[PDB]
Paper text:
The relatively low local resolution of the Rieske subunits may be indicative of dynamics in this subunit, so we performed focused classification to resolve distinct conformations. One of the three classes, comprising 72,118 particles, showed an alternative conformation for one Rieske head domain. One of the Rieske head domains has rotated, moving from a position where it is docked with the cyt b subunit (the b-position) to one where it points toward the cyt c1 subunit (the c-position). Comparison of the models reveals that the Rieske head domain has rotated 52° relative to the subunit in the b-position owing to a rearrangement of the flexible linker between the head domain and the TMH. A rotation of 56° was observed in molecular dynamics simulations, indicating that we have captured an intermediate state with the Rieske subunit almost fully shifted toward the c-position. The model also reveals that the stationary Rieske domain interacts with the bound Qo quinone, while the mobile Rieske domain is on the side of the complex containing an unoccupied Qo site. This suggests that the interactions between His152 and the bound quinone bias the Rieske subunit toward the cyt b proximal conformation, whereas when the Qo site is in the apo state, the Riseke subunit is free to adopt a wider range of conformations. In the b position, the FeS cluster is 27.8 Å from heme c1 and 23.1 Å from heme bL. Following rotation into the c position the distance to heme c1 decreases to 19.3 Å and the distance to heme bL increases to 29.7 Å. There is a clear rearrangement of the cyt b lumenal loop (residues 285 to 296) with a notable shift in the position of His291 and of Glu295, which has rotated into the apo Qo site.
Residue numbers in the entry:
A (entry chain C), B (entry chain G): 25 to 278
C (entry chain F): 1 to 432
D (entry chain B): 1 to 433
E (entry chain D): 78 to 106
F (entry chain H): 79 to 105
G (entry chain A): 9 to 187
H (entry chain E): 7 to 187
Amino acid sequence: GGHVEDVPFSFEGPFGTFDQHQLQRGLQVYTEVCAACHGMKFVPIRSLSEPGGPELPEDQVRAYATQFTVTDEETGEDREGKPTDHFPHSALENAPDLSLMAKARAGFHGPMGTGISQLFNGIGGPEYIYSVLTGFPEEPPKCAEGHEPDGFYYNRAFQNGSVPDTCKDANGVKTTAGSWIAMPPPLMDDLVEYADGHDASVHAMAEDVSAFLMWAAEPKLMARKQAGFTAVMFLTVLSVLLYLTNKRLWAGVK
Amino acid sequence: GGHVEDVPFSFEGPFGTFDQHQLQRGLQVYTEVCAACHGMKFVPIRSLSEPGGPELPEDQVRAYATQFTVTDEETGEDREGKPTDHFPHSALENAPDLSLMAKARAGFHGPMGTGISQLFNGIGGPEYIYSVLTGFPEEPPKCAEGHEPDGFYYNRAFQNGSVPDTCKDANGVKTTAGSWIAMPPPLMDDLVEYADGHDASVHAMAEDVSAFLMWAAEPKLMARKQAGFTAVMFLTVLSVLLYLTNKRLWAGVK
Amino acid sequence: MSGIPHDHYEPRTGIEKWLHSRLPIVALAYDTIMIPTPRNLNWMWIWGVVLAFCLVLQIVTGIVLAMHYTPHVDLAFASVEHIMRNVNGGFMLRYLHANGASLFFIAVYLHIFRGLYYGSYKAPREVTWIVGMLIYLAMMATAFMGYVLPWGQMSFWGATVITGLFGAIPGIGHSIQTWLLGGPAVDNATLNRFFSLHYLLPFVIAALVAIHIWAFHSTGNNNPTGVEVRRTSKAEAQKDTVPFWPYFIIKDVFALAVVLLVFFAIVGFMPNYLGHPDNYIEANPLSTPAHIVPEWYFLPFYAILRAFTADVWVVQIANFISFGIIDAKFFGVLAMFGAILVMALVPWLDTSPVRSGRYRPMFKIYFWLLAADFVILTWVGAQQTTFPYDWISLIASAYWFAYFLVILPILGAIEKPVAPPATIEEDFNAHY
Amino acid sequence: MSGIPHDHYEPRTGIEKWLHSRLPIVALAYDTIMIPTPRNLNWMWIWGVVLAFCLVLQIVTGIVLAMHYTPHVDLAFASVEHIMRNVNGGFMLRYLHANGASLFFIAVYLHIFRGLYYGSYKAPREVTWIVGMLIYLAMMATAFMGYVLPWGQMSFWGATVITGLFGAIPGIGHSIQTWLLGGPAVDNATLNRFFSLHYLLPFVIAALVAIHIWAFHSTGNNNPTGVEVRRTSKAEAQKDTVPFWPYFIIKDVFALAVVLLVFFAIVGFMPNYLGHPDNYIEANPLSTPAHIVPEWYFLPFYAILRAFTADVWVVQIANFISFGIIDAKFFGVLAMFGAILVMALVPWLDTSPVRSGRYRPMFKIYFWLLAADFVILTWVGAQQTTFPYDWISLIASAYWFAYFLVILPILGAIEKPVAPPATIEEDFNAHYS
Amino acid sequence: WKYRYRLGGFASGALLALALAGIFSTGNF
Amino acid sequence: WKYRYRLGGFASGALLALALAGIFSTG
Amino acid sequence: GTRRDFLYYATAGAGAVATGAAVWPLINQMNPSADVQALASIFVDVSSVEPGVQLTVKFLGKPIFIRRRTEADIELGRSVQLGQLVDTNARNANIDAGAEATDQNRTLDEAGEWLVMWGVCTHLGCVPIGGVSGDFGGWFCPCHGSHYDSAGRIRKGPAPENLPIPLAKFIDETTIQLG
Amino acid sequence: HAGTRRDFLYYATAGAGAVATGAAVWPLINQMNPSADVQALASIFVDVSSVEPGVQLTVKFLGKPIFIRRRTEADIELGRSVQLGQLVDTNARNANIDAGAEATDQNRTLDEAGEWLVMWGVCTHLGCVPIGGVSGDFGGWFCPCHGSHYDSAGRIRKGPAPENLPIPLAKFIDETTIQLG
Ligand SMILES: CCCCCCCC/C=C\CCCCCCCC(=O)OC[C@H](COP(=O)(O)OCCN)OC(=O)CCCCCCC/C=C\CCCCCCCC
Ligand code: HEM
Ligand code: HEM
Ligand code: HEM
Ligand code: HEM
Ligand code: FES
Ligand code: FES
């Protein structure tokens, strides 16, 4: 993963939480745009009503579910989707499944492999997702304008792509910060209308989907934070009372 | 099934073995007649070439497999059968799978719940199969001469079937020995042309196919008996040596 | 060690002395194998070694089979057929594990009835008896969950019935049932957790067996006379006893070998006789087979469960006085557990001072009646619930309970026992 | 037991009379827990209790997870998602188990380096050291097989690399690899047998730990001075010792509570930091990740493995003299095992009679070099095998062998140790006057 | 009497552990 | 000389088990 | 002073809770997971059948019976008086909880032709074998020999309760909703 | 005769117990050897077609994709239009040939007549299945995972690193069509 813009998402840090509205916006954008190619085969549709997620009402989740056509795993007949179904697999064969992409990508590295950057900044998966979505320039790098691979697009964040020979340094080393990706620039200004009138810039939509994809990768992050706090409190109290008991005991021998 | 015919089969007893030619005849009978309705989803077709079975040449098994065609996992589409494929599922959903039928049925019972009949006669599985195949009489029991079910056929070996209330008893349970089975009488004399010129009577074909289904249920009966003999010999030698050791050792304590 | 006068281990080889000064593992092993053992033991004492063998066999075959089984309701039956059909020796390994569970329950029923006859549960041996009861309960759970694993028709409907038993507990029972199931029905959650627990519990059984061995070493072995080894001196102890190695090690290994000759003969030539054909049918939640019969070692308890129908007078009384809190369902479940509970309490219910039953001329009768009753309970378990088998099973269950709760307390108050020998040496000499 | 004068258990209450006469389990427990322990132990003696806890944590979380995981390639990753997503607390149970493996390995490395410094491997404790090494090897195998179980990209390709090492062994290696895998390649038979063996080995580890605890109860604890407790009398023994309960039980449970406070902070607020993100990608046997890194506690041995190549002079010599039977691949595999073996043999390689490194003024330098070198191997194992990391890896690997095979044998001839204090009581009173 | 110092210890530990975990469940630091 | 009977016995008992389990079961 | 063992019990308390709070999740993870919770409600509709035979339909992991009873079984003289049953409750989700175990309160229709039930024996959950098995018509449970009459009412054996009637209603004369 | 000695008898019993052990252990480790997997070496018979992307298939063998390629209408032409000195990855590196050869266009083939050649679809120097279909401008393959292009002969010239698309055991090829054995 290429070096990301350090987006200040609201869920970061021990007290960070998901904004339900931002999650709903990201879900909307995913539904209107990304679901054309990317699946979420590990995400159960019923999770849309789960506490700490979008918390859509159950009838609205049911309405949402019915838009999908599901080959019934027992009947073989095609039917409307149900909340107990998962999101479809990726319709486009080479589009990666997004159920875990916000965990399956690191945006921060090193320095020198020491990992301290990931220690402070976290893994940076949402920031990577945002950087890819924001990473299509208005025009290619000035080098090798005659050699762009057909059917691919330059992205500043993507590092796994093909690179023209003319852009490779003689050592086989990438001169460009980015590389060419098969993903066409997916977002466009005001592409999705937020009914509340929220900002529909590409940056806003990219952030909202990055937050939604973070929730898709860790729906129970909130509960993990709360268990973390309650455990830390129990072990703090236990630590202090054991320290005082140890001190009282060992004072008796010296 | 009660009062199954105790057919002598060559594989019976500890020295019993499969007749390879009887197995090939049973395979032919199954393939031409029975395989239309029933399947053998647990039997790998390649096993027809393996020792102790029909032991067909691998090129013949490959030709045999090509008669099938299967929805291959990699192509998602109908693809001609290969020896690594299994036999197909039952084409008629009503018809049970035969892969284990010769083990899943008891022909012998009691006396008086003691299990001694099974202790001498064995489980009676292929004997039960033969009795069911041979079990269709020429004439119904005449208790429901105008009153028997239409979609079902009386069989004197089958016990789980429906019974007409004129044949049924409240005081007892059931007048007739058998019951009515949904399977039409499957065999007819000379229905299968044995290229060997062997007897193709209903009796002979029923024996041959029952032996084939026995091999289908226990394809390694031969190896199991060989291992039985080997272990019995080792434990006999060890038991005699341990007896003489114990006697010569305890003769000191006298 | 045991309180029998004995020679302690003495390291003599250089490596022996180097190790013994650092870890007395060899000293403990020597003490374990050299324990002075009563010389008058008969063939009923072999079953402890056969039980250890059965445990080792079932563990090792489980571990091997666990490399190929798949604990999923779409794959379990197919993976068992894969074991039966493709794996090198897999058919034999599976028939070994399946018949070994029967061998194991045979050896524990003979070990139990030995202990009951010779009074091996009496003081000071109540603790080794209790550890034995824990071992037996763990074996029962292990074998049940193992039998659920093939996901045949019998596996599925057994898993259904047995989880219903916990549902029978008034009030909380539905919670325990749904916690065992993980849901409203037997499904993949049940199979997968039953696999995990069937893997776990044999190691618990092994640790309990280790504690059982330590317990009986700590008391010393009982013997057919029930007279203790003379503790006075080495010279007297050596007359009453002989070292366990080699004499009884070789005796037990001989008996094990001759038992396994029949075991491997069965596994070779008739491995399906003890099983159920219906478990070769894939589980079908929509139709129960017409031959619902537990694996044979559970049949006495299944018989006791079935014996108490709602018309049984004691059940009606209990239902009345409980104001409906007890019913035939819950009464039957309580009885089916009481059958084991009351057997665990036998060290305290037997009031008699005399240890060995062979000097108890009335006790012999009720004991052999109990053994016949246990056979009847096994046999009635396989029969239908119609007349007369309802009466037979009810009478059998009543005698089972009456033996522990009435007959044993009375006999110790009224029996006129014979005088046992003065010493084990005397008995051994009298028999040569 | 240990030879230290001590009070045996006597049953007090009637119930204690009834049990103790029948089964001395309470007596054994008392004799274990009341063991007289040197007064001068420092915080480096906590790690055994941390390890004992970690074994319980791993066992109980594994058993819980084993109720929900499915060992099949079509279902394993999906069942791990089911754990993360539908099971009550299943996310925490997984993260606890995965980070608890790292906790377990850092604790064993601390416990080993404590032993290496204070000389707890020396006579009469060689058996305790050997049992420790067996425990460590069983942990290594357990953790590897466990890391294969989730069947991500890193699980599959790491297994494919590591199982490839057995393929290096001349002649038999192809048979050994095939028997391990159950085929030519990492596949469902590998996942299922690895699941079975991963369930099995924790109980074998627990048995070895029981033998380990019996071994040290059979020798008594070492202490920072290396000076043994006075066997002469109960008076002198008590002057040198205090009972393990309550003093050191409460000390170690306090230190455990602090270690678990930091562990649960990690598990709460950053559980994915130790993991590898590519293991959130399903195994794709066609498409290798850009860089396969085995997880951190394997890296120093994987570093040693990669550090030797046909470019290396000693490898060229080994190839020449072996007629190419020792190719660089098998040389590297032999080195990777030799690194663990030579640490196992350390009770016989350190010739010096002085036990504690505290009094060995030159040994301290080479020990702290070995510690830095272990850190360098851990870090270099993650780096790409180009210049200069090839040099840093080769030099570190060479120093690892040079420490056990050369420096330790020579120091026992050359070193001029300080004189230890006369007794543990003196050393204790010197701090706590 | 004596036991209420023990039991009061028992009770004191209970409320203190629960209350502090409750406070942090308000998430307001 | 020593190991006359001990070694000879061991090999005899081993081979005999291998013989009588093989040939009579196979033939 | 005694504040020593005050402190020692406070630390012991913090300990026993820290362990106690660790143990409960190991139990609660076996309670029904949110997917199994979600399957607790399902919608389905099922069609017509000839008289004298029964269907079966899966729901909630268990069978639903649908029998269209014979003339002999819709009538049975209605001979069973309410005072000779074992269980006198209708066990019917479609009517009040004070309903009695009467033939018409068991059936779904007014004539008594249509009887819809859980196919689950109220003893321990086995499927009762139907046709006209048992000694009172109706069904017979093979597992412990409980007998149900033609109305699915418990007559003999270990079962405590009549076969429960799920929430179900006709949509058309040809089909019946279950959810 | 055998000796009358007791220790003779004792050691004979130890021998019988030793072999009764060894014959019991071997099945427990043998079962871990391949079982159903040995039939992964299937015969891969297919119906014929002319034209290279017609009959030729990415078909799975040894659990992994393969290419079997008649040098029909592009591969022999381009094979007769790429020099041995143009290729990078040199040695024949081939199991169906007996011994090495430099950068050879044929002898990658089953036959010295060189009418069929075969290679693993699983491009193995890292891991990919490069897109065949005679595509890539030497008429061979190109790798989306890695960016190499391949000779129609299955041999590397352009790309980050030189390894040829590797050659498995194949022959017989008799029914005008894909076959293995
Ligand atoms: C299988 C391994 C299981 C391990 C379980 C460990 C559990 C730890 C949880 C609590 C233990 C906490 C520390 C207790 C320290 C006691 C120290 C001690 O030895 O003294 C006992 C001390 C007497 O002192 P002396 O022996 O005379 O002098 C000491 C110097 N010779 O006895 C006491 O009066 C204090 C005993 C403390 C409680 C012991 C019983 C604990 C059982 C249950 C209590 C838990 C209640 C929890 C309530 C929940 C509250 C949130
Ligand atoms: C895993 C199964 C078991 C094993 C491996 C085992 C092991 C042993 C062994 C080796 C002995 C000594 C030799 C002998 O008496 O045969 C023994 C004795 C005994 N066992 Fe078991 N046992 C098992 C189960 C049981 C059970 C289920 C019970 C009863 C509930 C039981 C109760 C006893 C008793 C009372 C003794 C006699 C002890 C004495 O003589 O002092 N054991 N056991
Ligand atoms: C106390 C020792 C054990 C007992 C009494 C026992 C009993 C059983 C029984 C009765 C079955 C059913 C077999 C059948 O009839 O089809 C079974 C199956 C099974 N057991 Fe065990 N078992 C034991 C140990 C183990 C262990 C330790 C493991 C795991 C390592 C294991 C793994 C399995 C598996 C995978 C199956 C299903 C495959 C099969 O059919 O064999 N078993 N067990
Ligand atoms: C020595 C103690 C143990 C160690 C060091 C250990 C280590 C590990 C590791 C490192 C993983 C990979 C975690 C990941 O990154 O996904 C794992 C997974 C796993 N372990 Fe363990 N383990 C231990 C004990 C156990 C036990 C006793 C079981 C019981 C069967 C078990 C069952 C599992 C299962 C099912 C998985 C895969 C599912 C998952 O947790 O992700 N483990 N183990
Ligand atoms: C499962 C992991 C292990 C556990 C639970 C364990 C347990 C223990 C415990 C409780 C102690 C006493 C307290 C202490 O000294 O910290 C101890 C000491 C010791 N351990 Fe371990 N150990 C483990 C692994 C190892 C390893 C990997 C080694 C090194 C190869 C090792 C070598 C030693 C030595 C030399 C001692 C000192 C013995 C003495 O002082 O006489 N242990 N161990
Ligand atoms: S389970 Fe249905 S009658 Fe008992
Ligand atoms: S792996 Fe495709 S040529 Fe590089």
